[PDB]
């Protein structure tokens, strides 16, 4: 029963792989480790991968700054 | 500075506003709000077959662009707010001059 920013912070410490659902896009979702974030929920994500669902393939992207506006649902995998 | 003030200058001007939805508007600006909400009169309006309307108020965020007359003096209209800011901001030896 914890604020979402604290939840993101425990993702930060645990360094668990994170799956982000983007906004109005079911086709692709982004994945990788949270190395840091800001007040606007922009996330620096390491070893990130694009995951088109449409068996799943993906593109390795390396280090990424993802803008928080895309964020629909942050998760752990 | 703020271009919305430049729009405020545009009262009684005949313009054609293209909108984000694609709608074309043609009319004389009665006023524009600072929101860039534009109230116009004698407006022919074409949704993407023209409808003729006495008065039309448009929400500013819907405005894509506004095409102004070519006769407009942009040099004169653009420089205002700086002068207004300067106005808001604003010994013996006085006469360098003599007799």
């Amino acid at each position: 029963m914890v604020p979402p920013i604290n939840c993101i912070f425990n993702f930060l410490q645990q360094q668990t792989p994170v799956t982000i659902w983007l906004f109005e896009q079911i086709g692709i979702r982004i994945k990788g480790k949270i190395v840091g974030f800001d007040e606007f929920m922009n996330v620096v994500i390491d070893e990130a991968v694009e995951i088109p669902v449409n068996v799943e393939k993906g593109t390795p992207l390396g280090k990424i700054l993802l803008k928080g506006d895309n964020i629909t649902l942050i998760t752990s995998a | 500075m703020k271009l919305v003030n430049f729009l405020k200058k545009l009262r009684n001007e005949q313009v054609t506003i293209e909108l984000k939805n694609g709608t074309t508007v043609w009319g004389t600006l009665q006023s524009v709000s600072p929101q860039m909400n534009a109230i116009l009169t004698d407006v022919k309006l074409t949704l993407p077959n023209i409808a003729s309307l006495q008065y039309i108020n448009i929400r500013g965020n819907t405005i894509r662009q506004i095409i102004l007359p070519d006769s407009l003096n942009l040099d004169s209209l653009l420089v205002d707010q700086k002068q207004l800011n300067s106005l808001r901001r604003s010994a013996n030896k006085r006469p360098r001059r003599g007799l």
């Binding site: - | 109230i39 108020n57 448009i58």
Partner: protein
Amino acid sequence: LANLIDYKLRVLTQDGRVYIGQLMAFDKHMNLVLNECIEERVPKVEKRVLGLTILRGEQILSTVVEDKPL
């Protein structure tokens, strides 16, 4: 917008639906309250009597003078 008060007005929504009603009040966000408001879709066809409605300013496209106040 204050002159338009109490008038019958036609508001065009974001989705293209056309609402018509008396404009009783507004606010900063351009949220409008419309008395005895009815909805028209295609142009009468598909007309419905909604009654007293608020409309959001984020959804509103434009408003025009429809008729005089009651």
